[PDB]
């Protein structure tokens, strides 16, 4: 019910603090604190992250430097994953703090990766006594300029209803009783500027309705803005140490609010502009993570060889998880590539997943050629260790698909692949005339292990480029028509069913469907009749064959309806009984899945309706009540369109519709603890 509190944001800001004030304490048990820690994260949600940063400034002050503790880490991760689809610097400060911190070790990386997206003893110089009066005089010169604009009257006693300013005069017209309000402040700030950087000397010329001069004539440079940043924190350090001494007898500068830092910065931007007069000018994001990442990458491979010869390893595990986090969360491109080649030699699972991530995130050519040389050497060993090569055999193929989004060394491995985990060898393979001769060779083989492997890159080669691909599909057609490794065979099948040739494929696949139809009817006859498990096995094999069958049938239908909108009428009629047979058959199908039976009926529905619907409505009723004898027993706009063997064809489509129509179609409390 606390959703959207733009009504009020101060009471909830105080309430959110005193809850976490009650989070750690001496006078509470495990039971009472678990109520509050569950009450806290229940309030971390159901409120907008506008008001969330009011405590997030206070948490990163306390927790992330130290390895109570989990109460911070829990509430943190439930807020940083609350907007990923000012305080940001505080988080990165905490991000490095947690890295400095890097059981309790596993309780940190989740919350971390979720956030991955002297003035009294200082001597005053000669001009510093002249600047403590001038920054007191320019302060009285700016204050009388501001108050009199809002109709501030002049009174001997300062009244608020009268807006009286009895200090409406200069510091040179003020005595020790009227300049004591600006004596210690302009002298301690000049002493704090001198104790920070010992430069108090005149090096430039100088610059009641008192008006301050144009002090904003020159802006802040790279050394002036840093000194103005040094003047705000020093004014916050002296006043902050004054608050820590007075209340004992608390907001910093860098982790200040977006509203608190707006009022504190005017005390330094006006003081450095007041110091700049009379020459007394005291003048002394992800790549940072990537720098430390490469810094960690150096010590990792150093330690990796230190164990290869025979604390940080957990930190390496802590980093790789964050590495897998940031890669998925995603000059600098080189730095990642530098780390990409850094980790690859260390391999020469957990890192490999990060390696697969980093390859998915996509000097190294030497590393590639050395790997390719190591691959062929392993291929020499394969023709004759295996674990370090097999993980490299997929990471390369990951990269070989990555870059698509040392040519000879690749070609050397290709011949080694052609020489002799056969499917994995067939996997990375696809990732001219010599191919053309082999193209007709497999075509002759289709006219009749390495046969499956050779067709992989051949599908990858023709796709890189018309009727040649049309021949390859027909070669792939008869190979399955004769027919496992049909799954990866089907993976390249839908990859290039783009580009008459379809009509040849239509005459081919119509035979493919009918053979499957006869195989379906045989199993249906087997279903009409131990032999029950065998029929279940036979249907499963039939479902297995139907899986790769319909997969090419879909994309081919994406051009058939594009064209014809005949042979498809046969193809609809053939696939009609298939869906009818699909209407225990699904039971074997579902196990084979662990669909295409549905989508086949979808594309065929448009074609079958392309060839009086009340009779179709009537014949659907008899098919929901054989009906072929019962079939024997806006329309002006429609007849304008439709005009632009019926007794069986209408009976054919009708039952298909009805099949598709069918297709689209307490305990008491003590009883619960009893059964437990």
């Amino acid at each position: 019910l606390f959703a959207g509190t733009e009504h009020r944001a101060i009471m909830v800001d105080s309430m959110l603090h005193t809850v976490y004030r009650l989070s750690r304490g001496r006078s509470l048990t495990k039971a009472q604190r678990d109520v509050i820690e569950d009450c806290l994260m229940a309030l971390c949600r159901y409120i907008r992250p506008s008001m969330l940063q009011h405590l997030l400034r206070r948490l990163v002050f306390d927790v992330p430097i130290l390895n109570k503790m989990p109460l911070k880490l829990l509430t943190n991760h439930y807020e940083r994953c609350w907007k990923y689809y000012a305080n940001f610097g505080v988080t990165s400060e905490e991000e490095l703090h947690l890295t400095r911190k890097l059981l309790a070790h596993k309780k940190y990386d989740q919350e971390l990766y979720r956030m991955a997206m002297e003035t009294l003893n200082v001597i005053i110089p000669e001009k510093l006594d002249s600047f403590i009066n001038k920054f007191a005089e320019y302060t009285h010169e700016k204050w009388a300029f501001d108050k009199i604009q809002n109709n501030w009257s002049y009174g001997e006693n300062v009244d608020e209803e009268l807006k009286t300013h009895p200090m409406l005069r200069p510091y040179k017209t003020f005595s020790e009783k009227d300049k004591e309000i600006y004596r210690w402040p302009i002298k301690e700030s000049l002493k704090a500027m001198i104790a920070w950087e010992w430069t108090i000397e005149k090096a430039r010329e100088g610059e009641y309705n008192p008006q301050p001069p144009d002090l904003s004539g020159v802006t802040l440079s790279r050394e002036l803005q840093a000194m103005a940043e040094q003047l705000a924190e020093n004014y916050h350090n002296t006043w902050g140490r004054k608050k820590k001494q007075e209340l004992e007898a608390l907001v910093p500068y860098d982790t200040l609010t977006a509203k608190e830092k707006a009022r504190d910065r005017e005390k330094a931007q006006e003081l450095l502009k007041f110091l700049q007069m009379n020459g007394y000018a005291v003048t002394r994001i992800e790549k940072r993570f990537a720098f430390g990442f490469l810094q960690q990458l150096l010590r990792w491979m150093d330690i990796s060889q230190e164990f290869i010869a025979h604390k940080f390893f957990a930190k390496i595990l802590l980093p790789l998880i964050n590495q897998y986090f940031t890669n998925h969360c995603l000059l600098g491109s080189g730095g990642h590539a530098s780390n990409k080649e850094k980790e690859m030699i260390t391999s020469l699972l957990v890192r490999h997943r990060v390696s697969l991530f980093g390859t998915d995130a996509p000097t190294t050519l030497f590393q590639h050629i050395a790997q390719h040389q190591f691959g062929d050497d392993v291929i020499l060993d394969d023709v004759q260790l295996c674990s370090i090569y097999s993980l490299g055999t997929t990471k390369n193929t990951y990269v070989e698909k990555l870059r698509p989004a040392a040519a000879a060394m690749p070609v050397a491995f290709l011949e080694p692949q052609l020489n002799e985990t056969k499917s994995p060898r067939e996997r990375a393979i696809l990732g001219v005339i010599e191919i053309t001769l082999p193209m007709l060779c497999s075509y002759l083989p289709r006219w009749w292990p390495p046969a499956l492997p050779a067709g992989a890159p051949p599908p990858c080669t023709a796709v890189t480029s018309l009727g040649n691909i049309l021949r390859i599909i027909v070669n792939n057609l008869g190979i399955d028509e004769a027919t496992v490794f049909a799954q990866p065979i089907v993976s390249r099948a839908r990859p290039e069913l783009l580009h008459i040739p379809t009509i040849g494929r239509l005459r081919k696949r119509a035979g493919k469907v009918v053979a499957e139809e006869e195989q379906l009817r045989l199993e249906a006859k087997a279903e009409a009749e131990r032999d029950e498990f065998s029929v279940l096995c036979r249907d499963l094999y039939a479902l297995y064959p139907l899986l790769i069958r319909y997969v090419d049938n879909n994309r081919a239908h994406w051009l058939t309806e594009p064209n014809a909108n005949f042979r498809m009428v046969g193809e609809i009629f053939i696939y009609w009984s298939k869906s009818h047979n699909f209407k225990q058959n699904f039971v074997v199908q579902n196990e084979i899945n662990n669909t295409l039976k549905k989508m086949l009926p979808i594309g065929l529905n448009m074609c079958a309706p392309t060839d009086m619907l009340a009779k179709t409505r009537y014949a659907l009723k008899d098919t929901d009540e054989l009906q072929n004898n019962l079939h024997l027993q806006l329309r002006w706009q429609m007849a304008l369109y439709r005009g632009l063997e019926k007794i069986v064809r209408r009976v054919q489509e009708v039952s298909a519709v009805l099949y598709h129509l069918e297709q689209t179609e307490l305990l008491s409390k003590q009883r619960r603890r009893a059964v437990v």
């Binding site: 392309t610 806006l634 304008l640 369109y641």
Partner: protein, 191 residues
């Protein structure tokens, strides 16, 4: 200036059946076509309130109470059909005869829409954009209706109308009007 909003007259609302039209887009850019509630305010951006359902062809996204990416952006000279089926509370957008899908693969751009007072077709043209709106008087004058929509069951809009459907555009000339008493910011009181 602002964006012009185009629609049909409030007599021509639909409450049932399944319907369809077509829309050629000549020069792409900022345009918007879809379906809208009859009580449509001409001040708002088309689809920002709860009165419109409208696809955007500039970057390929649907507009209703915000945005969500949807399908491919445009070319110059492609047909963007629209169709609705009130019997199932669905809205389907077809591009060039091919049915657009979501990021989840679903073709139905919006489901579970309340029927209410009805719907009526709506277009929107940004500055410079040119495109004609075939509302479907002559069936042969349509192009991609036979590819998709015909055998599905969708009838066109002006299927039996011997006169063309009158169109209502939003002006730019401001005119005076009495202040509504349910105005969220302003209110008067004759004392």
């Amino acid at each position: 200036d602002r964006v012009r909003i185009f629609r049909a007259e409030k007599s021509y609302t639909v409450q049932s059946g399944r319907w369809y039209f077509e829309f050629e887009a000549v020069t792409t850019g900022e345009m918007r076509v879809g379906w809208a509630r009859p009580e449509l305010r001409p001040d708002v951006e088309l689809g920002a309130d709860e009165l419109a359902y409208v696809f955007n062809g500039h970057r390929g996204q649907r507009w209703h109470l915000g945005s969500e990416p949807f399908g491919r952006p445009w070319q110059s000279g492609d047909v963007v059909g629209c169709m609705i089926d009130l019997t199932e509370n669905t809205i389907i957008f077809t591009l060039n005869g091919e049915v657009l899908m979501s990021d989840s693969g679903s073709e139905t751009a919006f489901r579970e829409i309340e029927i209410g007072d009805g719907f009526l077709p709506v277009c929107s043209l940004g500055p410079g954009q040119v495109g004609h709106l075939n509302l479907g008087q002559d069936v042969s004058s349509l192009r991609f209706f036979a590819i998709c929509g015909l055998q599905e069951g969708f009838e066109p809009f002006a299927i039996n109308m011997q006169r063309p459907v009158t169109t209502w555009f939003s002006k730019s000339l401001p005119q005076f009007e009495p202040v509504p008493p349910e105005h969220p910011h302003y209110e008067v009181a004759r004392m």
